[PDB]
Structure 1
């Protein structure tokens, strides 16, 4: 249940859109799964360097076959991108690695937040569990761990239409508006680069490159369309009130509000905080009859910062680590 790029024209246009003309060509580009090949040859012919990250060891000879030049432009390494810094305890098998060791071997170092981008990542999201991957990336972003410990990395992966529509949603199309949309729209800047049908991509399974031709008929029976997303983290995200030590309370507030959607903000604030909800909602400049659905994400951030900035009371929250 994996997929790659095996054509030449599509590889060519992806290679041209991956690197812009003003951008530095020696900027390190990390490909999260080169697969059998084809795409990496196009990236090499584009002019930029590559760091290859392949989950399956089976492809490691062919990927080593290219790059016979001693320039170090190819630099194939065996690991998996989404299993980086596993939180669960256990022996780190060769698919799993630590970000520290990998970025020590690559030779890349730390750059502060208010500075230019260190790297660029091209890749693709898993077929199942896109929500889990996005949640793990959000946890790594809000609290600077795993990849995001050094600087401000982009991702240029692919996403499905359902998860794309559940993200980027707002008041106006109110039905799909949920917590993950809010955290991602605050977290970074989102743009759309390219869209393609799923038939153009190859299909792959554990036994071999997927030989079922009626599986193409299943691809048309699903009629899924894939989107390319650029996610560049925002410079002013980590406000004095919203810090890596305070992100769990914000997540709890968002999950509490988007649970019981039809209620008002005051009703949820009665459970969340001991302070007066009318004071808070008049302070941010909004009304009591407002529902949580028609509230923009920046007002969610402003509400959290308005609660957090008050220093008159000793207790402002009813979230302890017990609730975890």
Structure 2
């Protein structure tokens, strides 16, 4: 995997995160962990490889304070459609309960901060999993708007930050995450980008709730199935409502292209369709 082995980078990162409780993912050799501890941070290390735990714990015994080492693979927490039968896999409810972390309302401020590095070959997977958890208000996001700082590859970074201004990289994860969190570049390590993802307080609305996000995901995947087609073409296969009428409601012309739609344009589209009043039904979603 990826491990922070440079002391200087560990110090810079420590000062950045210090800028509350810190959850460090896959500390490995513990360079960043030791940098944080020396900087005065209260650290909970979630180590997926048990071989790194001893030395880490040693560092804790050097400080003998509130540092805590847990044998846990953060990217395996709360497996979807799983039986909960693994040591590295755990439940965020039980872990946070042991760590004394209490849930706070969505409108409340950031209760906790998680930092780490995406897997070198699991960036898309992790982004999708975290997206499901966030939009579903499950996992860590059951406790509030968790701030997530993660190292990511340059390709997935550019694709994630893309938009109609750079259509070739614009995609579903771009829309979902740009609508979900305010992403900011905190550091660039050659290239790896440390991205900060903070959920937006105003993500959920009267018509966009954790109860209907599945329909929106279905709409996004459906539209991006044929990215070259027109938005109305896809809408004719997504809702019984007048597609031209809806697009006009969102202030777009009939010739509007999918790649020309901004994330907020998609959001206003979905909320507009859910808002429709004089129809026996609004969606055509029927999938397992």
- Output the aligned Cα RMSD: 1.3
Which 5+ residue runs of structure 1 have no aligned equivalent?
21-26, 198-226
Q: Equivalent residue of 1:190, what SS?
A: strand
Per the TM alignment, residue 164 of structure 1 is displaced from its structure 2 partner at its CA by 0.8
Counterpart CA distance in 2 for 1:185 and 1:239 is 16
Whole-angstrom distance in 1 between the partners of 2:14 and 2:67: 15
- Work out the CA distance in 2 between the residues paired with 1:142 and 1:188: 11
C-alpha distance in structure 2 between counterparts of 1:76 and 1:132, whole Å: 25
Deviations 1:116-157 (A, max 9, x none): 111111101001121111000000000111111101111111
**Cα offset, 1:71, TM superposition:** 5.2
SS at match of 2:264: helix
SS at match of 1:157: strand
SS for the counterpart of 2:248 is helix
Residue in 2 that maps onto 1:43 = 36
Number of aligned positions between the proteins: 286
The 3-state SS of whatever aligns with 1:140 is: helix
Offset of residue 74 of structure 1: 1.4
- Structure 1 318/78 Cα, relative in aligned 2: closer, same or farther at 3 Å? same
Distance 1:151 1:163 in 2: 26
For 2:151 and 2:248, how far apart are their aligned partners in 1? 41
Query: TM-score of the superposition, structure 1-length normalised?
Result: 0.85
Q: CA deviation at 1:68?
A: 2.3
1:92 aligned to which of 76, 85, 88: 85
After superposition, the Cα gap between the structure-2 partners of 1:160 and 1:70, relative to the gap in structure 1 and judged at 3 Å, is closer
Question: Structure 1 residue runs of 4+, over 3 Å off?
Answer: 69-72
**Alpha carbons of structure 1 residues 91 and 170: separation in structure 2 relative to 1, 3 Å:** closer
- For the residue of structure 2 that corresponds to 1:51, the secondary structure is strand
- Structure 1 residues 164-222: Cα deviation after superposition (integer angstroms, max 9, x where no partner): 1111111122111111100010001000011111xxxxxxxxxxxxxxxxxxxxxxxxx
Compared CA separation, residues 258 and 44, structure 1 to 2 (3 A): same
Following superposition, the deviation at residue 70 of structure 1 comes to 7.5
> Equivalents in 2 of 1:292, 1:70: separation in Å?
55
Deviation (angstroms), 1:321: 3.6
- Tell me, yes or no, if the aligned pair for 2:78 and 2:84 is still in contact at 8 Å: no
**Larger RCO (alpha carbons 8 Å, 6+ apart):** 1
Aligned-pair CA distance for 1:274? 1.2
Task: State the alpha-carbon separation in 2 of the partners of residues 307 and 55 from structure 1.
Answer: 43
Measured after TM superposition, the shift of residue 72 of structure 1 is 3.2
1:94 CA drift (Å)? 1.1
Q: Deviation at 1:92?
A: 2.0
Query: Residue 156 of structure 1 aligns to a residue in which SS?
Result: strand
Which has the higher mean CA deviation after the structures are superposed, 139-148 or 253-262?
253-262
C-alpha distance in 2, partners of 1:258/1:243? 22
**Per-residue Cα deviation, 1:285-314 (whole angstroms, up to 9, x for no partner):** 110011111111111011111110112111
Contact 2:43 / 2:66 at 8 angstroms: preserved in 1? yes
SS at match of 1:232: strand
Return 171-180 or 132-141, whichever deviates more: 171-180
Q: SS of 1:152's equivalent?
A: coil
- Deviation, 1:44, is 0.6
- Equivalent position SS for 1:159: strand
Give the greater-gyration-radius structure (CA): 1
Q: In structure 1, what is the Cα distance between the partners aligned to 2:281 and 2:96?
A: 42
**Does the residue aligned with 2:74 lie in a helix, a strand or coil?**
coil
Whole-Å separation in 2 of the counterparts to 1:299 and 1:250:
13
| Residue 91 of structure 1, CA deviation | 4.9
Q: Secondary structure at the match of 1:261?
A: coil
1:122 match: secondary structure: strand
